[PDB]
Amino acid sequence: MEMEKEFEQIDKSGSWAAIYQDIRHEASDFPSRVAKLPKNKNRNRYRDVSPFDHSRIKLHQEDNDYINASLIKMEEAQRSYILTQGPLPNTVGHFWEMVWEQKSRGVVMLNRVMEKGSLKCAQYWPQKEEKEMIFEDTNLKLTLISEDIKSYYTVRQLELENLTTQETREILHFHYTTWPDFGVPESPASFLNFLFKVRESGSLSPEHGPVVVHCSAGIGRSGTFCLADTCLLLMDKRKDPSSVDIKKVLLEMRKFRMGLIQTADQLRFSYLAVIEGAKFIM
Ligand SMILES: O=C(O)c1ccc(-c2ccco2)s1
């Protein structure tokens, strides 16, 4: 396998940091003017992570249409993803408005609410069936329907009601709960198993709106998830699977959201996953 070769060459030469910096150097730079307006300062978790204006998701309201979320459209793979930050106390209602307006079936969460002893995102979904959440600012109701807790992830069935029209939809919550506080997982086996469960649900399929994916910033773990999915999909589509260039897919994705893959260890882990997941379809 070519990727596993380029892989062994970088490992033996210990040049992961050098590859990663070349990607950082070649990555696209587009304006983020709406993100930086003073009215939007409390809608942004991190000062240095912003959606580009050309690819930002717009909320359907006249007041303020701004959320820290981007549409990543992969033309050849025929996949779309919305990458977004972990919701803030004042953006939980915007988050669910976006899920509603964009017709998403699935939410993918790659972080714990608390990590390293700090809050990484708001408790944005209900933890008990009989204690539903109402978002008065966006006129939505969210109810926990069921919860399936496994060793590496939890799947939840949620009901989202538009209180304005009384339509309801089922949203699936896929929560990967075992990403370590520091570094990346030692094996990609549990991450690939999780990706295959999201795919099996129909959440990634063209009959729905784009899947919503987040971690804390929505660029690191979130980038790893959509890079691995797209590379595996291209490998099954192209006549020469060996032609799939992970660095080139990543730069394409970086035209839509800045900073995807935050460390050289995340880049190496992405290779391992696409290598392992491929070596499993073969
Ligand atoms: O370089 C090589 O030999 C390959 C890389 C990926 C492959 C594949 C085939 C089906 C799914 O992935 S073959």
Q: Is there a binding annotation on residue 219?
A: yes
How much distance in Å is there from the Cα of 278 to the middle of ligand 1? 6
Residue 71 per-residue DSSP state:
E
CATH topology of domain 1-282: Protein-Tyrosine Phosphatase; Chain A (3.90.190)
Could you give phi then psi for residue 38, rounded to 5 degrees? Answer: -55, -40
Name the packing angle between helices 246-253 and 264-281 (round to 10°). Answer: 120
Q: Is the CB of 1 under 6 A from ligand 1?
A: yes
Element (H, E) at 281: helix 264-281
Place of tokens 């790893």: 224
Query: Whole-angstrom Cα distance, residue 71 to residue 61?
Result: 18
269 CB-near residues (< 8 Å, 6+ apart) = 184, 185, 188, 224
192 CB-near residues (< 8 Å, 6+ apart) = 228, 273, 276, 277, 280
Nearest by Cα to 128 from 111, 114, 146: 146
Measure CA 58 to chain center: 17
Query: Whole-angstrom Cα distance, residue 37 to residue 50?
Result: 11
Nearest by Cα to 64 from 40, 33, 48: 40
Q: Is the CB of 6 under 6 A from ligand 1?
A: no
Instruction: Give me 93's structure tokens.
Output: 């209602």
Nearest by Cα to 195 from 280, 78, 103: 280
Beta bridge mates, 254: none
Instruction: Give me 130's structure tokens.
Output: 């009989």
Instruction: Give me 138's structure tokens.
Output: 């966006």
Full 3-state SS string of 181-218 = CCCCCCCCHHHHHHHHHHHHCCCCCCCCCCEEEECCCC
The domain limits of the chain are 1-282
> Sheet containing 79-84: which strands, arranged edge to edge?
56-58, 66-74, 79-84, 211-214, 106-109, 168-176, 153-162, 140-149, 133-135
Query: Whole-angstrom Cα distance, residue 259 to residue 180?
Result: 20
| Burial of residue 126 (number of CB atoms within 10 Å: 0-12, 13-18, 19+) | middle
224 CB-near residues (< 8 Å, 6+ apart) = 110, 184, 191, 261, 266, 269, 270, 273
Query: Whole-angstrom Cα distance, residue 220 to residue 260?
Result: 6
Name the residue of 192, 242, 271, 276 whose CB sits within 8 Å of the most ligand 1 atoms, as the mutation to test its pocket: 242
Torsion over CA: 264, 265, 266, 269 (sign): positive
Q: What amino acid positions are annotated as catalytic residues?
A: 215
Half-sphere exposure of 38 (CA within 13 A, CB side): 0
How much distance in Å is there from the Cα of 84 to the middle of ligand 1? 31
Q: Are 264 and 17 in contact (CB under 8 A)?
A: yes
Q: Are 208 and 201 in contact (CB under 8 A)?
A: no
Instruction: Give me 194's structure tokens.
Output: 């999780």
Place of tokens 């990609």: 188
Place of tokens 């926990």: 144
CA 43 to each of CA 23, 91, 212: distance values in angstroms, whole numbers, following the listed order: 28, 6, 17
Query: Whole-angstrom Cα distance, residue 69 to residue 209?
Result: 14
Element (H, E) at 73: strand 66-74
Q: Are 69 and 257 in contact (CB under 8 A)?
A: no
13 CB-near residues (< 8 Å, 6+ apart) = none
| Residue type (1 letter), 185 | P
Query: Whole-angstrom Cα distance, residue 222 to residue 65?
Result: 23
| Residue type (1 letter), 224 | T
Using what technique was this structure determined?
X-ray
Question: In 10 A of CB 54, how many CB atoms?
Answer: 12
Measure CA 209 to chain center: 14
| Burial of residue 219 (number of CB atoms within 10 Å: 0-12, 13-18, 19+) | buried
Q: Is the CB of 282 under 6 A from ligand 1?
A: yes
Q: Is the CB of 236 under 6 A from ligand 1?
A: yes
CA 228 to each of CA 36, 74, 113, 133: distance values in angstroms, whole numbers, following the listed order: 31, 13, 24, 33
Q: Are 23 and 262 in contact (CB under 8 A)?
A: no
